[PDB]
Design an enzyme around this catalytic site. Sequence first.
Site, PDB file in Angstrom:
ATOM      1  N   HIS A  68      38.452  30.159  45.519  1.00  9.89           N
ATOM      2  CA  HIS A  68      39.146  31.493  44.673  1.00  9.89           C
ATOM      3  C   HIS A  68      40.886  30.042  44.466  1.00  9.89           C
ATOM      4  CE1 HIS A  68      36.699  35.063  45.896  1.00  9.89           C
ATOM      5  NE2 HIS A  68      36.728  34.673  45.039  1.00  9.89           N
ATOM      6  N   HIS A  72      38.656  27.831  39.716  1.00  8.90           N
ATOM      7  CA  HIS A  72      38.334  29.252  39.121  1.00  8.90           C
ATOM      8  C   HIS A  72      39.212  29.805  38.274  1.00  8.90           C
ATOM      9  CE1 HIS A  72      36.401  33.053  39.743  1.00  8.90           C
ATOM     10  NE2 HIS A  72      37.084  34.055  40.105  1.00  8.90           N
ATOM     11  N   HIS A 106      43.571  36.109  37.519  1.00 14.08           N
ATOM     12  CA  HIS A 106      43.327  37.414  38.081  1.00 14.08           C
ATOM     13  C   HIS A 106      43.123  37.265  39.796  1.00 14.08           C
ATOM     14  CE1 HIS A 106      39.348  34.331  37.526  1.00 14.08           C
ATOM     15  NE2 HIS A 106      39.484  36.203  38.777  1.00 14.08           N
ATOM     16  N   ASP A 107      43.045  35.899  39.831  1.00 16.49           N
ATOM     17  CA  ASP A 107      42.696  35.580  41.723  1.00 16.49           C
ATOM     18  C   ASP A 107      43.762  34.916  42.301  1.00 16.49           C
ATOM     19  OD1 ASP A 107      40.630  36.582  42.860  1.00 16.49           O
ATOM     20  OD2 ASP A 107      39.103  35.095  41.149  1.00 16.49           O
ATOM     21  N   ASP A 217      33.582  36.587  35.111  1.00  9.79           N
ATOM     22  CA  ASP A 217      34.760  36.746  36.727  1.00  9.79           C
ATOM     23  C   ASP A 217      32.728  35.828  37.850  1.00  9.79           C
ATOM     24  OD1 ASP A 217      36.165  36.292  39.612  1.00  9.79           O
ATOM     25  OD2 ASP A 217      36.432  38.908  39.603  1.00  9.79           O
ATOM     26  N   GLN A 269      20.839  35.123  47.589  1.00 16.75           N
ATOM     27  CA  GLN A 269      21.691  35.045  46.039  1.00 16.75           C
ATOM     28  C   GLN A 269      20.680  35.527  45.126  1.00 16.75           C
ATOM     29  OE1 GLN A 269      24.434  32.309  44.723  1.00 16.75           O
ATOM     30  NE2 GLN A 269      24.562  33.365  46.363  1.00 16.75           N
TER      31      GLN A 269
END
Length: 313
Positions: A68, A72, A106-107, A217, A269
């Site tokens: 993060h 990213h 956004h993060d 994202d 996953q």
Amino acid sequence: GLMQFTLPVRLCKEIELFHFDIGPFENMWPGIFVYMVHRSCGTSCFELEKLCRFIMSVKKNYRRVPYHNWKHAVTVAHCMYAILQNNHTLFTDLERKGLLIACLCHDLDHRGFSNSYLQKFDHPLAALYSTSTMEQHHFSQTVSILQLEGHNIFSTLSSSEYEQVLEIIRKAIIATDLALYFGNRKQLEEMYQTGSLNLNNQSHRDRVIGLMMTACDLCSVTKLWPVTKLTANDIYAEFWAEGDEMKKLGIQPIPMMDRDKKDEVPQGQLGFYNAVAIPCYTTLTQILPPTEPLLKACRDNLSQWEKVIRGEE
Ligand SMILES: O=c1ccn(-c2ccncc2)nc1-c1ccnn1-c1cccc(Br)c1
Ligand SMILES: [Mg+2]
Ligand SMILES: [Zn+2]
């Protein structure tokens, strides 16, 4: 105004493609972002000096965490760039301005921990923001940076246009709370299938932008397999650290966050692709047909994880 950003030939060509990897040269990422704003929005959208100061303060407010992080932020902004460039006429002038910035921010100030961990730790942010805890923080950080002297990239907008763009950014960042994605996609699925989806309905546009934010994202799962596989290491490095911090609070973490259970990652996953990623890119491709390459790439990576399980790699 006459100062264009230009990339080397391989980057100039491949940056147009959904599966583009921004590379390991951190010092090229600000230039890559400005290049994308200029082509997506226009050379006139932002004062270059203000935009550059804004970008460098955003970078500084991302932390040195495994996943993060600043890379990213720029990766998610690139996926949004590819969607906007492949859907030229569908988005307003304000949406193109807002959405690249929303993705970059956004993060902001992520610590590598989920909303769940902040709630169980009893972090101050969990008392300030009861739901979408980190996402409300990310938006708050975006507003803080926008209000630093010389950082207001929207200064030429009217009072009402400024309020609209910050509302686009707030909704886009809140929508990156994956807890909100499940219901958003289900509503979009119903609207598309009953034919009631209407892009002139502002509440419908908000939903479609929300799904675009989820798609951008998660875009690690839409890269070529070697990028996806190596990014997975960074994602699970964070999950395992959170698991360690859960164990320190006297809470057995879910298997996904337990480093003692790495053997279960391949099947985990598969679950993620089937439950989250494939449905996300499927609905996005129905609403925005030119985003089909994201779905194709996601499906290719699903097939690779099935090969990992069958011991074929
Ligand atoms: O590989 C993954 C496995 C599980 N989960 C996940 C499972 C439940 N809740 C949250 C995430 N996300 C991913 C993944 C793939 C790409 N991005 N992300 C991601 C990671 C952290 C946070 C956000 Br948002 C997204
Ligand atoms: Mg987030
Ligand atoms: Zn993110």
